[PDB]
């Protein structure tokens, strides 16, 4: 999911942080960090929040398969779940 | 002659604290405009890597230091720093610093160089010290195999590692042999420095043995002369 908080700015480059180690993908239009699975970094490179990848990678808790979710492009992971309302 | 030079090794005892300085000179560059890097290698072990810094900003730290080391720069003295408290006897390693241009803000990737320093001993045990006897191992006229004689000297009972050993203040390279150190049953350690030369310049030519202590501050030059022995 996107999360701009994240991007925040290290006084000259832009900042991403993470929620509590989760897994955060990230790259921004320049060349920088290319996948991002980190703690906080920084981005040497780019400038702006508006060019970079503010990701959350935070499969802890599966969900519904809404139509209006983006895939988890890595796999179908297990969570095989009741309804209750037969 | 770009140069990172490490200071503050020594023996510390458990507990304790320590900090570790790395001064950095010579490049095209600005100072600032690297990311740095310490790393520790253990006696008889792999690299491990402790933590990094750049423009005095993006941080990190190995679980094994974390909370316990604190990286610092200061980039008007050119100067990377390793505050390290609550030092354990697991910590004891030669610990370097390196530079890195992956991560630096100016961002010439075209133009990449890393650079290591020369590596800065922390020994975590109960502290003393002990300069080594340095003594001649002579070359004896019976033992001159097909026009080579052998020399050497023997550098004894010291503690902790490491003695450095030169031959005629390093004008003497080719041939020589420096041993390894040897734990003996005293505790202590002990090597052999030696060096084939010809033997017809046995007792025309002088041999010199150069042994740095650093710990004890002991600089012992000794002359080797052509005796049997």
């Known amino acids: 999911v996107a999360d701009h908080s ?14 509590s180690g989760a897994q955060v993908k990230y790259y921004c239009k320049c060349p920088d960090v290319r996948e991002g699975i980190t703690s906080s970094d ?18 802890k808790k599966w969900v519904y398969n809404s139509g209006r979710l983006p895939r988890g492009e890595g796999d179908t992971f297990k969570g095989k ?3 209750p309302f037969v | 002659x770009x140069x990172x030079x490490x200071x503050x090794x020594x023996x510390x005892x458990x507990x304790x604290x320590x900090x570790x300085x790395x001064x950095x000179x010579x490049x095209x560059x600005x100072x600032x405009x690297x990311x740095x890097x310490x790393x520790x290698x253990x006696x008889x072990x792999x690299x491990x890597x402790x933590x990094x810094x750049x423009x005095x900003x993006x941080x990190x730290x190995x679980x094994x230091x974390x909370x316990x080391x604190x990286x610092x720069x200061x980039x008007x003295x050119x100067x990377x720093x390793x505050x390290x408290x609550x030092x354990x006897x697991x910590x004891x390693x030669x610990x370097x610093x390196x530079x890195x241009x992956x991560x630096x803000x100016x961002x010439x990737x075209x133009x990449x160089x890393x650079x290591x320093x020369x590596x800065x001993x922390x020994x975590x045990x109960x502290x003393x010290x002990x300069x080594x006897x340095x003594x001649x191992x002579x070359x004896x006229x019976x033992x001159x195999x097909x026009x080579x004689x052998x020399x050497x000297x023997x550098x004894x009972x010291x503690x902790x590692x490491x003695x450095x050993x030169x031959x005629x203040x390093x004008x003497x390279x080719x041939x020589x042999x420096x041993x390894x150190x040897x734990x003996x049953x005293x505790x202590x350690x002990x090597x052999x420095x030696x060096x084939x030369x010809x033997x017809x310049x046995x007792x025309x030519x002088x041999x010199x043995x150069x042994x740095x202590x650093x710990x004890x501050x002991x600089x012992x030059x000794x002359x080797x002369x052509x005796a049997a022995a």
């Open chain 1, 6 to 19: 994240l991007l925040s700015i290290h006084s000259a480059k832009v900042k991403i942080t993470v929620p």
């Open chain 1, 81 to 83: 779940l009741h309804v």
């Open chain 1, 42 to 59: 920084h981005t040497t490179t780019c400038t702006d929040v508006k060019q970079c990848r503010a990701y959350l990678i935070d499969n």
